[PDB]
Structure 1
Amino acid sequence: PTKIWRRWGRKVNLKEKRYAVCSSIAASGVTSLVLARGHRISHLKEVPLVVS
């Protein structure tokens, strides 16, 4: 019988979480990865686009 004391959550190292966030930002910063992810950015001027 399923019990509520299953290991629902997980503890993730803070350093690993920060590494992952940094890497995600870097990956968002390159055109090929954003294109391969699924977005239609063929008409964007640059991938790390910033607006006023």
Structure 2
Amino acid sequence: WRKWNVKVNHNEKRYATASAIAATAVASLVLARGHRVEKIPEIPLVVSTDL
């Protein structure tokens, strides 16, 4: 009965995933994870839907 899971406010939980989405732009933070982006045309990377 140790607490295992954790509640996070649904609005704050949403606050994080809208930062993580705004953070996949801004090339400088992508390189800081690895993710060799040097060769890619631009960022964000938008591919035709046919994929």
Same fold (TM over 0.5): yes
Range class of TM-score, shorter chain: 0.7 to 0.9
What RMSD, in angstroms, separates the aligned Cα atoms of the two structures? 0.7
Consecutive unaligned residues in structure 1, runs of 5 or more: none
Match of 2:40 in 1: 44
- State the distance in 1 between where 2:12 and 2:42 align: 29
Normalised TM-score (structure 2): 0.88
Runs of 4+ in 1 over 4 A off after TM superposition: none
Match of 1:9 in 2: 5
Residue 37 of structure 1 aligns with an amino acid whose one-letter code is: R
Match of 1:33 in 2: 29
Deviations 1:1-52 (A, max 9, x none): xxxx010000000011111000000011110000111111100111201000
Work out which of the two has the higher radius of gyration on C-alpha atoms and give 1 or 2: 1
Give the length in aligned residue pairs.
48
Report sequence identity in percent.
Answer: 65
